[PDB]
């Protein structure tokens, strides 16, 4: 039924519709797996929590907002393709005395039953989405929604008890009558209840997750000109986080906004807690709610080489190649005498398998390519530096190791460590590439050891069948590794 | 066996090996198809032709040199999985004394028979290389070598009397003594015996092709400071071509880095460009990174994928590639031809065939974050080695595609390539993209839905098109719909509505 080499096979895609107090949006996946593309999203800002903490009901006006999108939504779904279709709704539904009623005539426009969730379960998968996004968590997450915030401790894969909090942008500013002084006061005395929770998370990370704090981020982004527009993995020391907040919240001198009762509600949170991090979470409760149906080995499995595996599948000229390099780099690391973090090995291995990925590219532009594509794809599970560290390992291969006006500015975000680590990779993977042509069978014959020599550091080995390949281009590539590493390398057969 | 899905089906890599005056190369295509991908790319300097006017034999150490550039591509030509190995040499390979001993050690090096190229084929090999990578090309190609120059008249698909000249850029700078004078007295002598066929290039383009004419050119776009450094299609008119080329030959008495180089063959291969653009006076010269080898490929391709469209033939790879619906993709292509002339857009066929490659390609970034997707296309789009396309059709295809991706107002990543593309190209790069953003939402990029989809005229006065969508998809209408439409309004300045029949 289609000549696309473009999609990953073996998955059927699905539709998760996520009903929630301000905004109702379909997002389809390639598939129900660890690192799926997302294939299509729509997003309508309907607002069935106004009034809601007021009057005992969802919106009115929303709700036919809301219906009319979902039947948009449903026939998006089929045109996509999609053999399944989750939906969630916010909890909300259940507070409201027209919830039963508008869940139910939902539920006849979408043909399909909608899992309405207790603060308990978005507490939970608020936390599922933090644990299935970033790589060994350590903190507390937050997610300010339109009527709660939810509050709960992550530590690698595991959660606490979450707590919920009234204190969601449209409750807040319904409830303070838009001001913001009665805003922090209900924020304070309902912060003030979990304090012990709260301090729990001094010194760790607070993981933001939710629209309105997502706005914040952005904002942020964009007044200090941050080069980087992804949020996530963007982090900000507590300072600079409380500083900005300031300036959110007084930002009279539209003014229906629910930027500054979110700031508030942050700033009573990080007041408590004094955490030595924020760390922005494009994952929240749909995405732990995914997380949830995955199998246990695909929980388990790294979304981050699972990506970049994914993608030298669909775009390298030898995904198992990719492979062999991520292995033969982890054993030649230990013999530069580089004793790597297993954050540091991730990456490492990330690069690797995304090292042939521009190989169409004009060959000006390769490098430049691996660098954009790689610094622009929708990993999780992976730092800011490590996004400048991979990028820039990878454009060192194709452009050498001189650093230049557009390897500058990675390099400021990688950090010294994983730029010479950068260098480091680049410079073996370009030794690598004069016998493999990037095709596997080569690579596990060629290998760097120890001498005996008092005046040699490191023999590179290749057997005598490969002698055709070496030659000048070979000692060239070999002495810039040693200059890099500052070793006397030596040739053998 | 491979998991491989980014390598186009049904093809067995091909290599050509080229053997010339100056260098030897390898290039593994994908396979023997009208616009395949590269494989793999390596080239050596050698310097065979070094001393071979007046010795009559090659140098030792460049006979040394080639011969251990084949064996190493050799090995290359396997590891890389080759199905089929093409070795091309120079007519100076076997005229050589020492010739026919290094073509029999490269044959057994390389387990294959060297075509041993005249003159003669060169010339219509080069050809076909321009013409294999130009839309129509219509005046003479002419291919500078290390030891000879070949002269071509092309028009369209067809092609005249290919010629040579002894006016190799290595050739003319030892026979002249390195004199620039002397140079070009046995430059204006040679090409002054093909005057007439010249003079019949007068008003139309110069294809200029070979390794020092290129080097020429990347001079050029190094000095003048020319934001795409793109081989292939690039063009000058007659009077910066002249001037440039004037610079080039007085460069040793900015510009340090060939004034230094002694040895260099610029300035030579500047007095040959200069003889035949004087014996010529053609309106401008358009680069060729194709050449013999690629001419020769076309030459082996079916008649069907020589006459296919190769700007199109690629773009539609790169939907089978990375698109989420190839078949979309053409539909696309399809429908928005059908859709321009009731917005009144009467285009050219160049026209025409830019809009459909800008489909082709509009989905080829869908992964990428959602915030870089138009950035990247861009990207992709100038970066991609693309042949039959000029400058401003590049500009237009990556304007086309950003715009689709985000949204229809300009910025400082836009202006250079409006600038580039020009005003026209862009309107139109501008009007695609605000068609694709509405028809997106009735599609999510899949088949099936947009060829039921159209415009009219609107009896209502105070409507002057409507998009009239079938009581099947009524069910589409939305809030996400009607903002993208009065965008295209506002864009084409035409009041629009949607007809929900
Ligand atoms: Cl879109
Ligand atoms: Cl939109």
Redesign the interface.
């Known amino acids: 039924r ?6 990953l ?1 073996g998955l059927a895609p699905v539709s998760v519709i996520d009903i929630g107090s301000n905004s109702v949006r379909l997002v ?1 996946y390639e598939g129900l797996s660890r690192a799926p ?1 997302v ?4 997003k ?1 800002l309907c607002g069935l929590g106004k009034g809601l903490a007021l009057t005992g009901r969802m919106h009115e006006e929303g709700v036919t ?1 809301a219906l ?2 979902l ?2 939504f ?3 779904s089929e ?3 999609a053999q399944k279709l989750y939906v969630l709704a916010t909890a909300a539904a259940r507070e409201a005395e027209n919830g039963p009623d508008f869940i139910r005539e939902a539920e006849a426009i979408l043909g399909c039953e909608i899992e309405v969730l207790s603060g308990e379960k978005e507490a939970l998968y608020s936390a599922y989405g933090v644990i299935s996004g970033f790589y060994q968590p350590d903190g507390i997450a937050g997610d300010l929604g339109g009527g709660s915030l939810e509050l709960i401790d992550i530590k690698d894969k595991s959660c606490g008890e979450g707590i919920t909090l009234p204190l969601g942008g449209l409750r807040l500013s319904e409830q303070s009558d838009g001001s913001l002084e009665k805003a922090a006061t209900i924020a304070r005395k309902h912060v003030k209840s979990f304090a012990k929770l709260l301090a729990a998370g001094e010194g760790r990370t607070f993981y933001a997750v939710g629209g309105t704090w997502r706005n914040i981020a952005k904002l942020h982004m964009e007044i200090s000109g941050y080069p980087l ?2 949020m996530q993995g963007y982090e900000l020391p507590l300072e600079e986080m409380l500083n900005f907040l300031e300036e959110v919240i007084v930002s009279r001198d539209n003014r229906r906004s629910l930027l500054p009762f979110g700031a508030i509600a942050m700033r009573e949170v990080l007041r408590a807690m004094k955490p030595a991090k924020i760390a922005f979470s494009a994952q929240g409760v749909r995405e732990g709610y995914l997380y949830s149906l995955l199998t246990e080995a695909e929980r388990e499995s790294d979304p981050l080489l699972v990506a970049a595996d994914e993608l030298a ?8 190649h990719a492979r062999e390099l991520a292995d033969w780099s982890g054993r030649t690391f230990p013999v530069f005498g580089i004793d790597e973090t297993e954050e540091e090995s991730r990456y490492r291995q990330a690069a690797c398998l995304l090292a042939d990925i521009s ?7 390769r490098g ?2 691996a660098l ?2 790689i610094a ?3 990993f999780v599970a992976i730092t800011h530096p490590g996004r400048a560290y991979i990028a820039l390992a990878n454009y060192y291969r194709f452009e050498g190791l001189n650093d230049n006006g557009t390897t500058e500015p990675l390099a400021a975000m990688a950090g010294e460590r994983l730029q010479e680590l950068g260098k480091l990779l680049g410079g073996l993977l370009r030794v690598v590439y004069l ?3 990037s ?1 596997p ?2 690579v596990d014959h060629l290998k760097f050891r120890k001498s005996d020599n008092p005046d040699i550091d490191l023999e590179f080995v290749v057997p005598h069948d ?1 002698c ?4 000048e281009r070979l000692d060239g590539r070999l002495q810039q590794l040693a200059k890099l590493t500052g070793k006397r390398l030596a040739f053998v057969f």
């Open positions: 289609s000549e696309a080499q473009g999609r096979t389809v593309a294939l299509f999203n729509e309508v907002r009319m999108a039947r948009r449903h026939v998006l045109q996509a393709q527009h992804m599948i669909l775009r390298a000229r030898s995904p198992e190989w169409r590219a004009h060959p000006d532009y430049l390519q954009n594509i622009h794809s929708s016998f493999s042509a095709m069978g080569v490969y055709d390949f070496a030659g």
